[PDB]
Amino acid sequence: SMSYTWTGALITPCAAEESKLPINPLSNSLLRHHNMVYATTSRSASLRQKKVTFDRLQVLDDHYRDVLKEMKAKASTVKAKLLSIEEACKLTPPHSAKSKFGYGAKDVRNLSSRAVNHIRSVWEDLLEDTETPIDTTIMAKSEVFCVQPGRKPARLIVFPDLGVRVCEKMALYDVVSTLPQAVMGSSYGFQYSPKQRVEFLVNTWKSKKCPMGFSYDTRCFDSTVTESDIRVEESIYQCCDLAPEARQAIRSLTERLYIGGPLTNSKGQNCGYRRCRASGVLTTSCGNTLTCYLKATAACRAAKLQDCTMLVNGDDLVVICESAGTQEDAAALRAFTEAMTRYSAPPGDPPQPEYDLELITSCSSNVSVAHDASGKRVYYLTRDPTTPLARAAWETARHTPINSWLGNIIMYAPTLWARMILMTHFFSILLAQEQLEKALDCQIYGACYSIEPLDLPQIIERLHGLSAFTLHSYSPGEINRVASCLRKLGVPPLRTWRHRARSVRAKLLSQGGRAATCGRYLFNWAVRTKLKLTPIPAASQLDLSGWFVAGYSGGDIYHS
Ligand SMILES: O=c1ncn(Cc2c(F)cc(F)cc2F)c2ccc(Oc3ccccc3C(F)(F)F)cc12
Numbered sequence: 027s028m029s030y031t032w033t034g035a036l037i038t039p040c041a042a043e044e045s046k047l048p049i050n051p052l053s054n055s056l057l058r059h060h061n062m063v064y065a066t067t068s069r070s071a072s073l074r075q076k077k078v079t080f081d082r083l084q085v086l087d088d089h090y091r092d093v094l095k096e097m098k099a100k101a102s103t104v105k106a107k108l109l110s111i112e113e114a115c116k117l118t119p120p121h122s123a124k125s126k127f128g129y130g131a132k133d134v135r136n137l138s139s140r141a142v143n144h145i146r147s148v149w150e151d152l153l154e155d156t157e158t159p160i161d162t163t164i165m166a167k168s169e170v171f172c173v174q175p176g177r178k179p180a181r182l183i184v185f186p187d188l189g190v191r192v193c194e195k196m197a198l199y200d201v202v203s204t205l206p207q208a209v210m211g212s213s214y215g216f217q218y219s220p221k222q223r224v225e226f227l228v229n230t231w232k233s234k235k236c237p238m239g240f241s242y243d244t245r246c247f248d249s250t251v252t253e254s255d256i257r258v259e260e261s262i263y264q265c266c267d268l269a270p271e272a273r274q275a276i277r278s279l280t281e282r283l284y285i286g287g288p289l290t291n292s293k294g295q296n297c298g299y300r301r302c303r304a305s306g307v308l309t310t311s312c313g314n315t316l317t318c319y320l321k322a323t324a325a326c327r328a329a330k331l332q333d334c335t336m337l338v339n340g341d342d343l344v345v346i347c348e349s350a351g352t353q354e355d356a357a358a359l360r361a362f363t364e365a366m367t368r369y370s371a372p373p374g375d376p377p378q379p380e381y382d383l384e385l386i387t388s389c390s391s392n393v394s395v396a397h398d399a400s401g402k403r404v405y406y407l408t409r410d411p412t413t414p415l416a417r418a419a420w421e422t423a424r425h426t427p428i429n430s431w432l433g434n435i436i437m438y439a440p441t442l443w444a445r446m447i448l449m450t451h452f453f454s455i456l457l458a459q460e461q462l463e464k465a466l467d468c469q470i471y472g473a474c475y476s477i478e479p480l481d482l483p484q485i486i487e488r489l490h491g492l493s494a495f496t497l498h499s500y501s502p503g504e505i506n507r508v509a510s511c512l513r514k515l516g517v518p519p520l521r522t523w524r525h526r527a528r529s530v531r532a533k534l535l536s537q538g539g540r541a542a543t544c545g546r547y548l549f550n551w552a553v554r555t556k557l558k559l560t561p562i563p564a565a566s567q568l569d570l571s572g573w574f575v576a577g578y579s580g581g582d583i584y585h586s
């Protein structure tokens with residue numbers, strides 16, 4: 027069936043949208059070529075639509091069916107609990123889209139009478155009406171990017187009302203948090219932290235006689251998901267031991283929301299219908315990971331690749347396996363792509379076999395190596411810095427709910443570009459404005475969190491280790507990239523940052539307390555007469571456990 031159907035009403039913006047980076051003092055400090063940084067707007071919606079509207083093709087074979095039963099089997103060991111309206115509410119973000127029935131995130135969190143009552147009514151309705159499609163809103167997502175040798179058209183987000191959103195949590199939160207791990211095991215990418223991911227990738231790579239690996243990029247994965255996929259995905263869920271209320275709630279959510287439904291723009295007009303994955307639902311991240319895994323796993327048996335190992339994060343896939351030769355490997359990869367195409371997961375960029383792990387990119391990131399004080403090789407997770415910086419620049423000029431930079435510092439603490447530019451730029455500013463105290467919301471795997479800037483040293487040591495404060499002698503590959511990028515975005519050179527960092531460091535050490543800590547470990551790279559960085563007290567006390575369990579992108583989740 028057609029992924030989407032449009033009535034002709036436009037996808038409209040519920041306010042004014044900014045497309046160009048504003049010229050201000052602070053941002054200009056990070057990067058000069060501001061006219062290269064832009065943000066998507068509903069304006070390009072039409073273009074997106076054309077890219078995602080098409081008629082799917084799907085042919086399931088015995089390998090598909092086989093793997094499904096295999097996955098079903100493990101899922102059947104799971105027992106998911108129901109969530110009280112409280113727990114679910116406590117999980118809703120404060121910025122989350124307000125309800126169209128008279129309440130908002132604020133009220134939902136305050137367990138406000140009006141909110142909780144409507145929520146209660148929506149649940150009751152999911153238990154009674156098993157048919158009626160649930161209404162959803164469509165919006166052109168507004169993200170920041172850098173220009174390229176045109177521009178990326180806005181991404182479309184589909185999401186139900188806050189009422190239906192809380193119920194989803196109640197019926198499926200526990201499910202989408204445990205089930206994936208139980209089903210995919212070592213392959214579930216969200217169970218790992220950057221360091222743990224790197225470890226998994228490097229161990230897998232080494233466990234092979236002669237490694238071969240590739241990243242498979244599906245063309246607009248969501249729109250490729252078919253009504254069959256969603257139903258199959260629900261069947262896995264149905265294997266869990268669930269309360270009747272939840273069993274039915276899930277059954278209803280599947281038929282009324284997940285497999286598809288009506289599209290309403292911000293104005294309130296009917297835009298069309300959806301028959302593919304909705305990006306703004308709780309089951310998006312879990313569902314896409316299950317689906318992608320299912321297809322790829324079966325696709326590897328069809329293509330006859332040997333000893334496949336998958337790493338899946340939603341629609342993001344990377345496979346590592348035993349090579350069979352250059353020629354044979356390209357044939358297998360091609361076979362693989364076709365199998366996946368049959369399964370309704372055609373490629374965007376044709377996959378290319380990789381024999382050098384550092385060259386494989388998944389989750390917009392890759393694996394590289396640097397050295398610690400002792401001088402031994404240390405692998406860490408890194409990525410091209412363009413987007414992070416561009417957004418960083420944008421987040422410096424305008425106030426925005428989420429701070430991609432803070433999240434990036436956290437996830438990329440050990441990288442060259444993260445420590446040299448981001449850490450400096452932002453600490454320098456916070457130091458100026460006197461804001462080191464204020465907490466800031468950010469995101470990890472799609473879930474919002476609230477971190478205090480002055481706690482970064484602890485976070486970084488526990489998630490990466492002390493080496494993240496002393497790495498050096500980065501690969502010539504990584505170095506070239508960073509430099510190439512700064513040159514492109516008009517970002518100040520190495521020396522300029524060192525000088526700036528050298529100054530911030532000083533200003534930080536004078537304030538003492540948690541600040542000196544930041545200045546001591548975070549900017550130790552700047553001073554020549556180094557300092558001995560020892561295990562930080564608060565580090566071995568942080569409950570970062572929950573930070574890396576499952577994915578929630580688009581799932582409207584906030585871990586308080
Ligand atoms: O391998 C390194 N080993 C150490 N340092 C010092 C250093 C560091 F260990 C971490 C850090 F957080 C900031 C730093 F300064 C480097 C500093 C810059 C660099 O790369 C470049 C070299 C020449 C020009 C431009 C660059 C650039 F844009 F940085 F890539 C490579 C290295």
Ligand SMILES: [Mg+2]
Binds near residue numbers: 243244245248341
């Ligand atoms: Mg895709």
Ligand SMILES: [Mg+2]
Binds near residue numbers: 217218219575
């Ligand atoms: Mg974990």
